[PDB]
Subunit: 162 residues, 12 copies
């Protein structure tokens, strides 16, 4: 009802569910919804597919660049929860190592609200030691790592209540 | 099992469900799946979001132009059913009046298999006389008009059996 | 005074009068004025020539695409009258057959307010049977067809009162 | 001898015969020959392949746009016959419904001379009800529909005599 | 009747009246009409909106560059009057100081016929000392400055008689 | 506190101080701050370097063109002082001669508030007669010429009080 | 029946007959047909006009570049005859002097099968000494020079039998 | 003989040896050879220099993007060994930290076969602590790190046997 | 007086004299003057530098391509003399071997009037055997080779008299 | 011998003599020669036509922009004379009014050496009052105005001696 | 005096101080100054704003790419100190993990001189565990981390003395 | 030791050995090394792969064009030997016939030092009469033709000694 939730989409084909998830959130209590995309995510989701379901901003690296300022960092501050779903190995690896080189990773690293991450990758990657350690680091950040999607957004909304 | 189905996507935001529908069809009996997009549909679905679920071709006007030939018309001939879902007012209006100016409308007008159409538009358009008459014309073509999505593909698969 | 009027411009050289008409409307009672252009209309009118006289939006297909959403359909809903003046043979033919492939035709087909159309073409086209039938269809839509420009906007403003 | 004939080419591969037909006409009595192409026709014929055989204009949508004015409509007025050969389903459908959205359809709808049309399409389209009705409409226009190419231009030249 | 008049358009929104003025002149005695545009004027008028009313040339900086030669200077020589209407502060300032950096200013400075100028600007500029002095300089050139549009073209046509 | 100040930046390397000056003004009483750039100034300052310190608009010629309207002239009207700092020889020369060919010069010539100018150039230019006369003209305009930067903005803020 | 024939097209307007010739060959015994174009030939023939009649490859310099490898040289090796028809003066001159700077000349110089060449040029070139000598050189290569088109392809098919 | 080997090339000038190495492998027992390039590697090797020696795919980020799907991940699965040679500091650092942001790093992190890495960098980097730790991490992945090129491919082929 | 002369310019820096030579010819008896440029010549001469002195056509490869037809070959036929001055080694080599791959070489090889050539190159090229033989071939063509510029055009004008 | 001379070229067709003049200067005593072009001058002279005769820099606005710094102002300081020949009305007007908006005008206004200007324009401009006054202003600058080209460079070289 | 210092600028708005800092260094003892920018830094600083104060090179990724070679690595070797100020979270994270994917990170990782880093970020990032660990890693590299700008360059100059 | 050698690379895949050969030469006595590429060679070698091994210039047609002047001809003059290795059929054919249309062929034809050529082509071309004659012509030029690569550069270095 009174919640501002920011949804982040990574370069996984699962992010085609973005518009469906945004509608699920919109067609429920969520007051403000924001969506941010990594560059790779834009090969699987278009911003025009998200805008009809998103009463906040739909942010890409190009959108934020041409607008100037740091509107994404304002949105991080204004969020009661930030969800990265799907979260690719690459995005998890960047967050785990503090390398915020796009708008999605900058939003997460600027956020002080609960952060829920939903890793998605082939299990030929999810058991690799380097990925295990990244999940360890992400969890030391205080982030919630939901291994292995409506269940994910339920946990985010609960955390956003407090 | 032994069926070749071609799915067509129109410039409605509902066509973001394309990849989910293609996976539903793929994760079932369908043997060959093809997908064709109108130019306007590409603002809502990317071809890269469809390709992982489509063991046939993913066709756009640009894809077919640069390849040369009429591969879409070969695919129409090889199809046991053609589904347009969603079908915009514009696409319904073009088919209803024999104006096949893109690959999607050319596939439908070349097809001799069952054709199932799923109109999607605001009801401020669906009760307009011109749209009613277009649906009359589409139905005189022998096309199945499913007013007002898994139910739609079920009817297509039944017709494709005979 | 309390009226929202949307003016649509077609690919006829007569649409160079757009800015003059918008000023006439603005320099009178009209409360909100919107203007939409077909792609062909943009070879005869620039958006920058309209903006100084238009306190609402000036919409083209490119403007609406990059903005995302359906702001033109919101504007159709918010309009007390929609005027297409000039209305080319091509635009009349598309409306008459329910083929809304640009923002102007989508606005008209989404509108539930009075719609006034001002055909403009060489009389070598206006007596062609196909054009006569299109005008028949447009008039069955409930649209007001003003054969053969201030008089046109007067009729629109009267209808918008009720 | 004293005749001005305008030849129109549609997006069918048969329009590669354009240059051969223009030479046949040129290498005979025809006094002025003009040629107009639809955008789709330009994937099958180049203007440079036509110009050596055409003592009038070779018109495309881009040619006419950059030149300004309506030189194609002047050419329609100056023609003693207009031939569309090949005429695609799409072009026939547009003419049949009064939607002149390119230079070829504008020339036909502006012409007051005899108009001869040569449909070309797969018979999976030519027996479709919507195409049958379009041919009915084209023939109510007074156009000569030559179902199912030198024979076509012979009929055009006879009509141009009166 | 026997007069050649060149009309120049500046980067003021008033130059949208260009096509209407050209038709007024054309729909009267004027024998040859030419039109030239500054680059800024092209954000308010298109050349395609002028060409149907202009039996001479419609000149822009790009048109003249790609054509080569100085066709605009030939047109200045062939003119019985040159009208700049509207004349922006910038164009007045350039003429007043002999800086002909575009085709419009080159036409005026090459002309030996009567030159009529119609300043248009917000009165926050027209009382500025620098603009007053520019008008002084323009008038020392022998130009007719019509402070503060059919009346303007009437004065030009009278001067062109002698 | 209650002041609207517009800062203009010219094509001098000194305009890299723009962001620092905007922060100095912002980190003080100034209520609304606007910034406008000449095209040459954009080789030394980016708009993204200014936006974080500017609670009004950051205007370039391209920004204003694509937005349509004259938002810069609205901003001139709404300003209690306009500062050009640095002011190049070229910009001083244009203002001095009433040639407002970009957004910065248009803002100054439209402004009725105090105008403070800070010339910056090599003294091989500042003693040239033509530049001396331009400063004479600028000062006859009522502009404050601060020969030969915080001191400049102090004078502007004092004048803006009345 | 069992023959692989490669047809090469040069920058002569006669190469518009390419699609007609390819259909003649296809609508006969020829088993594999390949077509290669010089860059200049592409101003007279499009690849999309050839592809429907060509069951092998349609090769241009750009096609081969982006594909990588030397697929044209594989096709030369696999050919039972190579026909250049029309063969321009420029292409004849390059072959005659061993300068294979495009895909067409590389195919001929790599071919070990019979090579049939059909010169086409104005007789103001065909009697020039330099062209006579080039034909001498081409014929010393073992190539068949058919001075001065179905007859040409008949000779090629006979040679391909042995 | 029966082995599928994938060779990866990084942005080191040493990757100009790629084509020579691919020929060495091809001119030996290797059955299927694939090559993948990082974006930086393409300033030192062209894909056209590799294709003649590579009977599998030559993959770049652009190649895979436009093709859609994950053909590189299929190739990782089908490989009996993956060699990165040369492996830059940047590529080693990305693999070491699970950041697969290009096709080369995605292939390695998806591979379940032996992975052999050949670091190449100035020793001013190879003794840096951060690089030492990356090599530690790479070796904990089970990768073979060949400090400090035919010897490297020999070790890969031995591992691929089992 | 009654002569049509075509001047050709090659990629030598000496062709900057083109405009001066065209004026010399124009400021004398020459009735029609045409100028053609090789692509390399356009790095040393612009067409806009020639047009003011040339009452015929100024032809480049791009000019002729976009115009369609063979206007250069018409100009060759209409010429009483063709001069190539300067003539580079490359252009001499192409003519000598019948390789007319640009508009300049096509004009010469189509011309039946006297042809005068003025070689210009470093003497490190003019004594090379291959260049000597090319001059032998050019002279067997009947061309006049003026080893080693007003004197050259005098010889051309004398030959053009007969 | 020991002199550094900078030659400036304006947008007059006379600047095609630039390369000839630079060679005349080079083929004499001049030690360092620099050349600068206005943007309009580049439609009549190419930089590649000047470079072979210029042992200093050949400067355009684009050259200086991409290089950064003010190399043209360094060259002004290092010059013993600066010649503008031809000097257009526009360039004279800019210098006369202190508006150095390109590299050529910046060089002149930065120069402390003798400056020689050679006006070139149609006498329909040279007797205009505004141009007369500009020449008055140029001469008050201390510049030498050579009304109405080797004679011009002789005067410059004499002044450069002192 | 005898020192070569390389200054690196990251994608923080603080890097607009780059030109001011370079002038401070230049207007002091520093003998050679170099500046390198990350791609993101170029949205806040232009190279043209730095060049006037930098007697060495101003390096970007594009500059180094087009020049070829590794001039940045030569500059790293020639430096007595390298300062990254501001250093973003992203750049710190890359250095901390040995991922030198741009010219700035390559310069630091190649440098054997003292390296001083000035982190700049919102404290919502500087207390994140992943950033703390990166600073730990940077400091294990021997780098000087100046938490939380003239003071920073003072420490760099002291270290460069030894 | 004291030798300047220029290496030329043709459009053969063998030119990928360019960087290895340049290093072999550099890692030996050669004092100055230059490298020039044909346009086709750039699909197989990048300039950035050569620059690290080349202490002279790496020249392409685009490099030389944008630089102006004839730096390649200066390099030809300064060379003690010029090697073309590999030399394609096309490049051999051009040299053999004096057609220097790119920088590589211009360097060879300008060179007065020993010239060593290493033909590389499929033997389906090397026994063609036209290629045999080209080798005859190349050898009459005094060039050394090394039929059928370190051995080639050894012969060049021996000749360069005298
Ligand atoms: C956000 C958005 C949603 C739209 N949804 C629909 C829709 O659901 N049904 C429809 O007929 N048109 C819809 N339109 C309008 C169509 O996109 C438009 O008519 C288009 O030209 C259809 O093109 P196509 O039928 O060739 O795909 C929508 C437009 C926008 C901007
Ligand atoms: C073919 C041609 C020749 C011209 N010749 C002159 C000339 O001789 N003198 C002049 O003042 N302007 C001449 N002009 C107009 C100038 O090019 C125009 O004023 C231009 O903007 C000058 O720019 P610049 O002074 O910055 O070089 C000519 C224009 C054209 C198209
Ligand atoms: C993959 C490939 C390899 C080639 N190898 C050769 C070759 O080894 N020798 C040759 O003469 N031509 C070869 N060619 C053809 C040449 O690239 C072609 O003739 C080109 O225009 C030569 O240009 P250049 O001599 O100006 O560099 C090859 C072409 C391709 C696509």
């Amino acid at each position: 009802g009174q919640l501002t939730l920011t949804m982040c989409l990574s370069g996984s084909v699962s992010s085609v569910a973005g518009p469906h998830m945004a509608a699920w959130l919109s067609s429920a209590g969520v007051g403000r919804l924001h969506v941010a995309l990594t560059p790779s995510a834009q090969q699987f989701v278009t911003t025009n597919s998200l805008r009809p379901f998103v009463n906040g901003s739909v942010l890409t690296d190009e959108t934020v660049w041409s607008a100037g300022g740091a509107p994404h960092v304002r949105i991080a501050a204004e969020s009661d929860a930030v969800v990265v779903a799907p979260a690719t190995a690459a995005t998890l690896g960047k967050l785990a190592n503090g390398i915020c080189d796009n708008i999605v990773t900058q939003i997460v690293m600027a956020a002080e609200c609960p952060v829920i991450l939903a890793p998605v990758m082939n299990p030929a990657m999810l058991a690799k030691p380097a990925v295990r350690r990244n999940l360890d680091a992400l969890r030391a950040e205080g982030f919630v790592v939901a291994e292995p999607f409506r269940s994910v957004f339920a946990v985010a909304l609960k955390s956003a209540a407090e």
